Amino acid sequence: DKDVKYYTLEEIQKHKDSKSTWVILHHKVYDLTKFLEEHPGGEEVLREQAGGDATENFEDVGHSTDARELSKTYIIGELHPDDRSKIAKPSETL
Ligand code: HEM
Structure with missing residues (x-):
């Protein structure tokens, strides 16, 4: 509802294809x-x-302050609070 767009890992993982980066x-x-x-x-x-x-x-690249603010302009929502409370640690990488 409401707030931001709390999206789950799996949902976001669908959003990599053809045309939803x-x-x-x-x-x-x-x-x-x-x-x-x-x-x-x-x-x-x-x-x-x-x-x-x-x-x-x-973060490897680090990115300038500008990019940080510009991120906000592109913000759709956040990681679902479920996983957020327990960011058990990514398997990694690259
Ligand atoms: C919120 C999303 C992002 C925004 C708004 C953003 C914004 C920007 C901006 C403004 C710059 C210019 C940096 C400069 O002037 O020095 C930049 C450069 C760059 N970004 Fe991002 N960026 C985002 C995500 C990413 C991600 C996730 C990657 C990697 C997968 C990436 C890789 C790079 C690289 C490699 C350059 C510099 C390339 C070079 O050496 O010329 N960016 N970004």
């Missing part, structure tokens, strides 16, 4: 479907992971 960057779900080409860094790097923990890759 979601990513989760620090507990927050961003649709970047219309940002792919705009991204001063490119579509592919975005589309590589998609529907999942692009936090790792995002």
Whole structure:
């Protein structure tokens, strides 16, 4: 309802295909479907992971303050509170 868009891991994991490039960057779900080409860094790097923990890759690069605010402009919602209370630890990677 209501609030933000609390999406579950599995749901977000569907959103990586053809044309719904979601990513989760620090507990927050961003649709970047219309940002792919705009991204001063490119579509592919975005589309590589998609529907999942692009936090790792995002923070590897670190990203500027600008990008952080610009994330908010693309914010659709958050990780479902269920998993949020228990971010039992990702199997990892890359
Ligand atoms: C909320 C989503 C994101 C936003 C709003 C965003 C925004 C930006 C912005 C503004 C820059 C410019 C950096 C600069 O001026 O130095 C940038 C660069 C870049 N981003 Fe992102 N980004 C996002 C997610 C990602 C993710 C998840 C990846 C990796 C999978 C990625 C990889 C890169 C890379 C590699 C560059 C720089 C490439 C180069 O060296 O020229 N970004 N991003």
